[PDB]
Design a protein around this ligand. Sequence first.
Ligand code: MG
Ligand code: MG
Ligand code: MG
Ligand code: MG
Lengths: 204, 196, 196, 212, 125, 222, 233, 223, 195, 195
Amino acid sequence: SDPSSINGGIVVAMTGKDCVAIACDLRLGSQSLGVSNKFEKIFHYGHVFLGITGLATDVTTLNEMFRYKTNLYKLKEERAIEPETFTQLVSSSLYERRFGPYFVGPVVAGINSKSGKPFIAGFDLIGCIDEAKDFIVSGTASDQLFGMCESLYEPNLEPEDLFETISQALLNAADRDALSGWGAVVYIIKKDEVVKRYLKMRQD
Amino acid sequence: TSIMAVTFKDGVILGADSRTTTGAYIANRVTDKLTRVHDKIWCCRSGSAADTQAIADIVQYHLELYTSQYGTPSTETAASVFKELCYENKDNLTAGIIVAGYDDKNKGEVYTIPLGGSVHKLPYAIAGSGSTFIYGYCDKNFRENMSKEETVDFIKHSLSQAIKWDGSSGGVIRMVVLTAAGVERLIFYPDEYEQL
Amino acid sequence: TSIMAVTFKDGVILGADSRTTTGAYIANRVTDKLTRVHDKIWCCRSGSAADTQAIADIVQYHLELYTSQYGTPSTETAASVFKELCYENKDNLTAGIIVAGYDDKNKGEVYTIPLGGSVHKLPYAIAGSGSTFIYGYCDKNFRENMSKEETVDFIKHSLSQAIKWDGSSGGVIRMVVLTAAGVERLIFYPDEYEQL
Amino acid sequence: TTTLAFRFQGGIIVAVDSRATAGNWVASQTVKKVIEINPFLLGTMAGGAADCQFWETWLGSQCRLHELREKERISVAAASKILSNLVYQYKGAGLSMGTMICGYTRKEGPTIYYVDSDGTRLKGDIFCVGSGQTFAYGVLDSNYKWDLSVEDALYLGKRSILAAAHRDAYSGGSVNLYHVTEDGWIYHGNHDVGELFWKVKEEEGSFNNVIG
Amino acid sequence: GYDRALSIFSPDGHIFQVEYALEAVKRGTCAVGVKGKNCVVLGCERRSTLKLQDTRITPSKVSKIDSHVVLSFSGLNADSRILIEKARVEAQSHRLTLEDPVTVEYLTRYVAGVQQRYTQSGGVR
Amino acid sequence: QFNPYGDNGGTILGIAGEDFAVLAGDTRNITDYSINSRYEPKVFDCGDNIVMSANGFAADGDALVKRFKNSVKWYHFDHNDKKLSINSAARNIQHLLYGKRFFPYYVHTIIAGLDEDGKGAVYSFDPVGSYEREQCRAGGAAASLIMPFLDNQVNFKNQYEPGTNGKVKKPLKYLSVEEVIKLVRDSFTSATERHIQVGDGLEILIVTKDGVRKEFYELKRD
Amino acid sequence: TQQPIVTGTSVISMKYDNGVIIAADNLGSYGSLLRFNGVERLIPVGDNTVVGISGDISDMQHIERLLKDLVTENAYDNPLADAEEALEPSYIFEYLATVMYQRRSKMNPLWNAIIVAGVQSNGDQFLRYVNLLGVTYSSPTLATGFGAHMANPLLRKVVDRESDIPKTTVQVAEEAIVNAMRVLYYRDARSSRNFSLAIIDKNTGLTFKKNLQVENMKWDFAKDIKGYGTQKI
Amino acid sequence: TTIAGLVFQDGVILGADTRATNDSVVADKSCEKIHFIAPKIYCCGAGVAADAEAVTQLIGSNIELHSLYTSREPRVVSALQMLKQHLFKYQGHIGAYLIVAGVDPTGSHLFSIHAHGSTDVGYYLSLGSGSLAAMAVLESHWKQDLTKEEAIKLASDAIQAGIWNDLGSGSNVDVCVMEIGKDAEYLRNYLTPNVREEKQKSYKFPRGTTAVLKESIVNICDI
Amino acid sequence: MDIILGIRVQDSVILASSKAVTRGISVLKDSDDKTRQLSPHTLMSFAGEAGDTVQFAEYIQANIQLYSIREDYELSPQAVSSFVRQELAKSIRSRRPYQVNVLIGGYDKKKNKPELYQIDYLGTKVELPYGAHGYSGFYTFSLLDHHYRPDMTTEEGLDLLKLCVQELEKRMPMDFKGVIVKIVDKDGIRQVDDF
Amino acid sequence: MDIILGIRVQDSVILASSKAVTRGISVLKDSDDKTRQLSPHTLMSFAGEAGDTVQFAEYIQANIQLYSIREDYELSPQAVSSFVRQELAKSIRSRRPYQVNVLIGGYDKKKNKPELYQIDYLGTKVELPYGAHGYSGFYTFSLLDHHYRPDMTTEEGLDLLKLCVQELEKRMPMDFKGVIVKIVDKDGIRQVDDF
Ligand SMILES: [Mg+2]
Ligand SMILES: [Mg+2]
Ligand SMILES: [Mg+2]
Ligand SMILES: [Mg+2]
């Protein structure tokens, strides 16, 4: 009945030294029934990464919407959109549906190509921006993620250390949520290389 | 309903209108809401007519049996018996009762028992739907140790206004005077009190 | 809320308390409920604060535009504009407004506009939650063609009682005097009016 | 929750998952859903955890009193009916129970009774109860035979819970196995579903959909 | 209710009401039970003081408690009907709850228990 | 309509070591968005080397603890001052809770102590009396924030040995009392940051063969 | 199950170095009608305890009678009724807390919030709260209703933790209580100007102050406030 | 949320806490609830956080265009009128509760604004779940002709009362001071009374702890 | 429980009752016998709320068996049906009523006649040549009205019953997993094992 | 409508859809084809609310056929599924939403690969090796998880499907009256007439 917890799933994002990480589980369900173990929740538009939890039809719809908008942005601006600007575009787009909202929990992650500054942001379903220095959490196990991140996180982690921290935060949070899990992906993002890693986890 | 009781120098006076309504229909225009539980202990009834009559009949029984054993009860004792019934059966009662009485020791006393079944001893009390419209008037015009004639005028003027504004109140203004001299009934008709 | 407007020999006086509540919390204890729609046409507001402010702002706009075209509007005209907004939007408004004004031709006039959006021209009017407690007092004490000092006392005593009994009313008593001489604001503090 | 029990040549297999949830939140992965009524009788937990624990512990007390008084092992029929008659008295009050009472006596042989909080009492060969019951039934129905060995039957019960643990969001954690014989039940271990899944995937060639 | 202790100990450690109940049994018509290898036989005396009796309808001395268990008695006839009724009810109650008919030992133990209860309950003989 | 239940917030945590047990709880008591008390003890010594906490609706929590303490007293009278073992205490608490099955004590109960072999023991109860022995159990408001962290740091879930890449699990080595207390403190500090009902103070009761000891630590008061 | 009819608003209280202070206004409200202006809601029990009660007044009068009956009962066959076996604050509280929890457990509560303030035999300060649900708690400052939201923040600035209690004198504590009562009069629509205040001190005993008034009120700034936005007159 | 506003000698000051809470969990520990409308007009936002931000930005945009059109510096009464008329139109469905303060050619002003569109004038105001705690402090200590140093003290004290005593409020204190004839000074993290203590342990993992199925390079570069 | 049918022919009563037991989502059993022998020549089939059906049936069975032992005599089908009706009629104004519908098929050894009684959960009794409970009558009664004769043999009664079950299997949405069929005549009660 | 199953094997997609149409009390039909050919190598099966299912299916069919004529070209299965998803995603925030769940089985002639897409009424799209809608997955997925291989032949896929239908016929309460089975491969769409 609650649209934000029909399909399930989680996203977490973290900052490190000259890098950001964003990660998500791979489950899509119909309440108790597991439907797909390949439903990725992280997308990218140039060098800006967008994770989206919540109702899966809206996750797909918003991805297609921001692809549309960032493509037109690029053609007109003659440059790729930056994380700070994209964050405002996500907020605007969500708030324009104030009284018929998309049931989602978006998360932005990326590095500003000109300043080199790591950037993360989270939103509620109507576009309120949370621009955290440390970490952003989203989804059906957001409480569990808050608990993991708040203890596991320390600032200025190197990319390969940050990978371990965000992975362990996601995995152990997902294992305490019925509607999350069934595989996981972690993106490690630096200024001009991005590594994607699929994690091995319990499949129940 | 508009009811009040007022203490004065020689004792206490209870006052009431005579209207009983079922919705907007006046079921009885000459109701007697001033009721006797003992020789010089009376009460004014508001709320459910069934409930307040049932209570008053039980109290009258309790004070009659009290009198046979222990002699004349105090007004405080009568108020206590009313309170006991109202408080213990608060879930199944809609009763707002003012108890007024005359002792020779204590003189005129007034106790008000609202919906909850609490007791409040007061120099005067007002109650019933029509009382809302005269809180201002009664507070400005009441004095302690008034004469009989002044107190009759105070009650007459007060209930006149309560009747004027409240649709649920109307008819005749009945009064009962309680003093050492005895028990006096008074009645005041519309043509008298409306022109005040 | 306790609000009133009273006509007298030289014109009209509007009076109000200053309490605004959200449930039992007093959100503002120094509210100004006497509001200006034209130079010598004011109103008292009761009901939804949002609604009455929205209405009063629209009326002020209508009378400003009236004045640019047709000269000074009558108090009756102001009451009519208020009524039109209240009556046509009765389903979406909770507004109880008293309109008071001074012409040189008509002198002091008072119009009350209750919830339904009806209009009633009166010698004086009372409204707001606290007005229920002073219907008796106001009816007994109002006279036509009072002096300024008598009318100020009448409003001060009346709203004093309304404040005393109504939890929703309180704070300072604000007043606005409308005469040929001009517009005078008055304020009365708790230590003054509580001892009356 | 996923609980199953089935009769076969070598007695009864009982297999259960270990997960308990409160909404989406996974409260426990280490729940004991087989109640050890006595050394010869087992019961399964589904619906209300307290209702199943309390009244099947109580059932053990009534079975003990029976054999003291009658100098003989209580039948599975009589044990199950003590419980069903008890819960039937409470019908309407809001008890929540779905359980298999499992035993192996001389006079009856291996016997399973499905007992339930609206008063149902059914004898049967195969039962599956819980949110993941439909998944377990699929594996059971297609592979069940009377002439299964004890080893193969234990695996079938283990594999059927795994099927449910994978698909059903409210089932998982670990698999507890029991084998009921005439001389009593025998515990066949706690098996983590995480470790079991990968083991079964590789050895059996199943779950090709899942990347490992 | 009538609570009077009728069955009580005497100085010599006897309960006279229980012993006087045995004297009522001594007066009753003779009953005998003999078990063979694959049967049991119950024999009963019928006193021939009473002729003109209707033997079709007169209460028979042997009573079925269930289809597999019988009860005969010696003593007060009216008293025996109360024990027979209670036993018959218990036999059906046992079938209903245990899903098995009573053993002969169980049924005996029940009837014997009822008899005992009436030797230390108030207001009963 | 009269609602007989309420929510006084709070969070509690029980951990069973090798030869010890801890039961920790925050000292904040709340209703809605108001603080009732910054120091209202929630974990109690019940005698016989058993510690108890009934978190949730504080009136039912106080009632249950009071009744259990009394049950320990009467166990001594009735059974010749025999020590009530932790397993026996647990079963007794089930009957206290299930006794009100149709008007429950609205609490999540945890007890801690030592079993009859001297090993650390924690038992966990739902409101109507279903119970289980456990190694690690958080209860109350911020339980969802604490348990994932404990799975990872006590039981070493999802942690494997470097160089093997998933093939060899990190071995389950035994934690000392000092190590457990560090994890308790860090759990509650993290919970305090992200849960509004958790804060003010942390009281930990430690149970060993020597007896029951107390430790108190400040938490953020916002 | 009932609903409260005639009601009393906030009871506020705090500990200081040698004892406790408790206060409550003299009003019995009938919904939004300020019906009864002479209601005493602080009820002393002996010379060492004061019970402050808010909520339903009929239930308060019942509790008042229970406490009066408690004192009578304690005196029965008790030569030390006015000495070692006198009623303690802790005894009175536990009794009330038992009654409150039992009544809620029969789905028929006494619709009140109660603060028991007093000083024990050994000189220790006693201050504890109980309500219609049987919920209990203790703190250096306690308040009911609106007092919880407005008085506690002010009183906690004086005594923020246990170690602030020995540093707080009776003059400072009373001052804080009196100021809190003024703030409640400004901001609580079901309060009154008239209140009672009780001090229970381990040296000077029970001082009960009746007919106090909120004074030194700031209203003068109201004259300059005009309209709700754009109005200049 | 605890937000407050009060006036002093030749100015007005706003205060706000920095905690955002969805249900019982703290979503953000350092958010800005004092919103920019114009260079010398600011707005404290309570209620629904998105609504308070969105409504201030829309009115702030329209105020800027108005300022350019009229060649005059914007007035607080214009921001007030535009906000209330917008909020009234939506009948409370935009759940914004705001305290608006600023300096303009007319002088210094302080208003409150409720979700349904009612406005109030005040010398000291507070809104949000911590308003009662904040107002207790303001009613105790506010006086006429406060100095700037006294005003900042009182404003932060009012917000602190909310932080400590309201579970809805927490973390740090933000302040904005608007004085006549001066630039407005926005003092974010004016007070920092809730820094987390150092942790007992370090939870940094050994490298290789996490099991990995697959590794791949993501192409983010233009074709 | 779902379908229970009854048909009284010349010299016997035939009762047909479905085998399925469904608990919401899954069919838990496909061989359930929804009947109890009350006496050697009286059979009762039943359908209604889970638990209550069997509890009621076994309670009736116990009482009739008690009567048989006490009197050394079998009650007539009419007498048994009146006893059952009264218990259901008592039940309907209880705190929690038995939601159980029954058919009672019996052979009266005194009159040498088969008898079928239909009793619903309210205690509404009717003697019929053929009967059903729930939706079973909606599908089958048009066939029974057409083909039924009072002088039918047992074999003709079974053939007419097959036609009724075939119509149920065609037009009913639920899979009731076939029927167990039992015959009540002068020799007692027996089950038709192939149907 | 009730059960719709899909399985993608080596070189084809197999869709199995129930034949029953029930309107409350009675089964009105037992030969209903719950599918439409969208293009020569794309088939869509459907289940959901009465009326809306066929109206939606035929509306999609018309639009894909229109595209085919305009461009003289067959859209890929992926393209068709994205078009169908958008229409359902548009629908869910309408005045009255289409309550329709679909499976799209297609053979991509460019890539030489079978493709199965599962789309629910909300517009939730997933590409799968096997899929179902409603309660069908609850019974069948444990069997498919066990036996499925990506290199299965069409004959092996049909045998695995028979096992799924047998399990449905055993444990489902409703009689869905068997299934029509259709195969989508490089040669187009054909119906398996004996199943
Ligand atoms: Mg999971
Ligand atoms: Mg699972
Ligand atoms: Mg009248
Ligand atoms: Mg706080």
